[PDB]
């Protein structure tokens, strides 16, 4: 018994996943995975933007009903909140200017400036295995900030979902200085098991409507149309 309105929080700074086009309209990989299951779920969804690390607390305030907004699917995060079945793979990958020395090592980051979005995988990670190291890391209200703090030279590297990064960042204007400083950063513990729907654990009903449908546009081929809009890979990954 689901509400007649789903209302779906996300950080609009994470192209090509989330982000606002010239007119600030929602638009990326999430929304349309987003209205795609919503559409099939038979619900209205009113998007809601909001600051990376608001997501999660305006969830448990239920001011939104749920976040779609490349949120892994960690064990920490579950001590909190529940999600949908996993959305798209994510790992992370630290980016640098072109012909940076910089690796994601605590040898080679000591000393240097680190940014991060605060709230995020990538800020737990940073802060435990390099700021206690003597790394200056920066954590930053969205990645938008990061990316011109990078271009402005205040940055030497910065720490994101990889495909975020490339597509949103590398491949585009802004970034052409710019590539990935060593290879992506695997860890378990910290990084999850690709993305989800973040939800309240007692929304069960609207877990499994967002299970159903997503099962559903992936099972009709209608995820890897959509995907391939933006991606020329296995985004799904395993
Ligand atoms: N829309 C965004 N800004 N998403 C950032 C997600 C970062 C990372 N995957 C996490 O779950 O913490
Ligand atoms: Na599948």
Not at 52 to 66: C, N, V, W
Not at 104 to 115: C, D, F, I, N, R
Not at 161 to 181: I, M, N, R, T, W
């Amino acid at each position: 018994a689901l509400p007649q309105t789903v209302r779906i929080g996300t950080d609009t700074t994470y192209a090509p996943f989330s982000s606002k086009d010239a007119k600030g309209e929602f638009i990326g990989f999430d929304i349309d995975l987003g209205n795609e299951m919503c559409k099939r779920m038979q619900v209205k969804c009113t998007w809601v933007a909001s600051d990376f690390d608001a997501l999660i607390p305006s969830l448990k305030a239920k001011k939104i009903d749920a976040i779609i907004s490349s949120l892994s699917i960690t064990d920490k995060a579950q001590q909190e909140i529940a999600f949908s079945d996993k959305l798209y793979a994510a790992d992370s990958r630290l980016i640098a200017a072109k012909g940076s020395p910089i690796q994601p090592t605590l040898e080679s980051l000591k000393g240097k400036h680190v940014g991060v979005l605060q709230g995020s995988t990538q800020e737990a990670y940073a802060n435990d295995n390099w700021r206690t190291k003597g790394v200056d890391v920066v954590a930053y209200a969205n990645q938008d900030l990061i990316y011109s703090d990078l271009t402005a030279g205040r940055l030497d590297a910065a720490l994101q979902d990889e495909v975020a990064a490339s597509e949103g960042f590398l491949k585009q204007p802004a970034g052409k200085e710019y590539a990935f400083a060593g290879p992506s950063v695997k860890d378990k513990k910290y990084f999850g098991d690709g993305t989800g729907v973040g939800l309240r654990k007692d929304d069960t009903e609207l877990k499994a409507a967002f299970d159903k449908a997503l099962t559903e546009l992936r099972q009709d081929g209608t995820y890897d149309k959509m995907a391939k809009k933006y991606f020329d890979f296995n985004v799904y990954g395993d």
